[PDB]
Symmetry: C3
Subunit: 280 residues, 3 copies
């Protein structure tokens, strides 16, 4: 039989080793069951606690138990979580006390709208990202996370600035989403659109999102996961979106009497990691 459930004494009139029991091991008097009972129960109960603390069973014959289940504790049980819903409640398992390598990225911003003239429109900036380590969390439920929504594009026509991306926040740290691009009419160069920032509790490392350009190059800023995206000279509004999460669309271009609606900025995501024995 594998399972043993082995705290030995289990409330058997136990007794801590007194000062004389610590200056030297035992005494010339009789060896009482009371003290040896604790001297066995404490050791075996902590052994059992380590074994079963990683969702394992204490086998009497294995004698290894995944190297005291430490391999399951350290190497295994690493259950990463990626968050994509607009807003929800992140569950905390019972035994989890620390979240490690929490990464967040603000949503990027869509680019500007360009008409059939001569000058080009601007691309939206990229959202910001940060990493925090050794994040203390309480058992139960985590603070409801919020993510940065994808950069909305106003397809009502050319010359209308793109919508800015949403700002994500979790564990008391807010990642400002990238600002949307600026749409201008002919013979007009838009302004260099600033990207997102990090606000709130200072992260260990912060990545300010790439900021959008005027429109001569028209590249959308990236993020931790996203890279700059370049414009595409097309006459059918192919409007290739941001490459990855947090990036900003390249925006509209201007060539051959065609109007580009503008690039699309991808939303932001939340990454949290923790070692638990339960269902992630």
């Amino acid at each position: 039989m594998a399972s043993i459930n082995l705290p030995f004494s289990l409330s058997g009139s136990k007794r801590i080793p007194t000062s004389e029991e610590l200056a030297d091991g035992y005494q010339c008097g009789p060896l009482d069951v009371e003290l040896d009972n604790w001297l066995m129960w404490w050791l075996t109960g902590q052994v059992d606690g380590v074994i079963e603390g990683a969702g394992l069973t204490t086998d009497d014959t294995d004698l290894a138990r995944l190297y005291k289940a430490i391999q399951s504790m350290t190497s295994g049980n690493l259950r990463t979580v990626v968050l994509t819903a607009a807003s929800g409640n992140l569950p905390i398992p019972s035994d989890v006390s620390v979240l490690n390598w929490v990464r967040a990225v603000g949503g990027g911003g869509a680019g500007g709208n360009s008409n059939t003239g001569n000058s080009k429109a601007s691309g939206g900036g990229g959202g910001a990202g940060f990493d925090r380590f050794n994040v203390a969390v309480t058992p139960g439920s985590n603070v409801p996370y919020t993510v940065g929504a994808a950069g909305a594009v106003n397809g009502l026509g050319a010359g209308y600035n793109g919508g800015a991306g949403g700002s994500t926040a979790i564990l008391g740290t807010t990642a400002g989403g990238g600002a949307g691009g600026l749409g201008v009419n002919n013979n007009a160069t838009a302004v260099q659109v600033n990207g997102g920032t990090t606000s709130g509790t200072t992260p260990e490392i912060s990545y300010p999102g790439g900021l959008g350009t005027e429109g001569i190059v028209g590249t959308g800023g990236g993020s931790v996961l996203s890279q700059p995206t370049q414009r595409a000279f097309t006459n059918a509004g192919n409007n290739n979106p941001a490459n990855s999460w947090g990036g900003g669309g390249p925006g509209g271009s201007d060539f051959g009497g065609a109007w580009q609606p503008g690039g699309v900025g991808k939303q932001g995501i939340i990454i949290v990691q923790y070692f638990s024995r339960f269902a992630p």
Copy 2:
């Protein structure tokens, strides 16, 4: 007196303890070494199993063994293996049961070719990439790994498409490589080609490769580790290559009769991390 080799019983007439001896302590009657032999053999076997799990010699007087080799089990014994050969196998040591943070990058293609005209060529695409955390791996010999090839250059002459990029695959997940840039004649600008693509089993986090340009800006799309690289305005064919793994070619410009084949993208790599007491 460092090495002790201390499992106590080692076939010394062991026995499973009774249910009552787990409910209550030792019976007050005559002692039974048949029981205490197993009771102490189990504990010492667990402890020296922890000691050997990190490849440390069990000691009697040290009483720490670097926190029972746990300090060398979590912080130490961290092995990083960089796979670069296009064909090979990953030797998984015996004491490895789960592989975590399997960083993989695909190789990016090279840029196109432009003749002695006015219009430039498309920059090479970038290879995709992904990260998988806590991958289940059985001890022994792993399924052979495949890393992508570098960005081939069709150095035959101008006006020809660049070489395609090589894809990488490992553990049932494939990170496709970025297609090479298109070759162009004079008085015509290239059309951008998409970058790397994620395929196979769904990774926990994927980094799509930065795609190329039509040619006017002519940046070489980056990757997980590589950032975009612009072209070079030199008539000597300097055409500097991508910065790092997964990058693409900046492409060949077209000014003053320049025969620029463009840059050459390097190949992707696979980075894994596991915990072992053997050599990396």
Copy 3:
């Protein structure tokens, strides 16, 4: 009475059991104090060392100590130290022998200066980076870390080479810094400037810094942390800097007879993680 001064014997006439005593269990002879002292002392002292080396206090009846305080050794006590001082020493705690994922990035270089003319100045290179995992050090003091100084803009006048940023180096590995931009006069544009490179003890992974353009594109230097930054087309010389550490100035700009000095090169930083009960 939480803490106990827990290791049981403490000079209580300990004698190691013989090899014959290790081959079998308890012998038919009478109970000897010198065996039952050591054979409990080693187990209980190993457990006490594990508990007290994790920064947790021994308890009598807790029976868990937060699962042997291993969570304080796997996830807890995960200490992150980022260095942003210009120069100085990096202290190593008394129990720290290995640092996890030592991350460094080279300093960035600002771009060149542009006068009032059709041509634009060239940008500055970006610092290089490298990650070293499972680096071995000694408890005590470490080599004085040398971060790269931020690349200051060269405001000496029109067409002057930009200021270069320092290179970073720590623990036998030196990452090249981002060279400054090249300053040229109107009706003329310089050539690309190379970025930093990884030198010293070749790490597991190296991030070569993003190099600037000839000047037509004028993108900022890139790095693993800092994204390339574009130039500002403004009449007041807004000189947008690099977003994060290691980036480079996008170089001097000009349109319609403007004088823009160009962006400023950001500095390099050092990131390390180690495990220790001592707060950083």
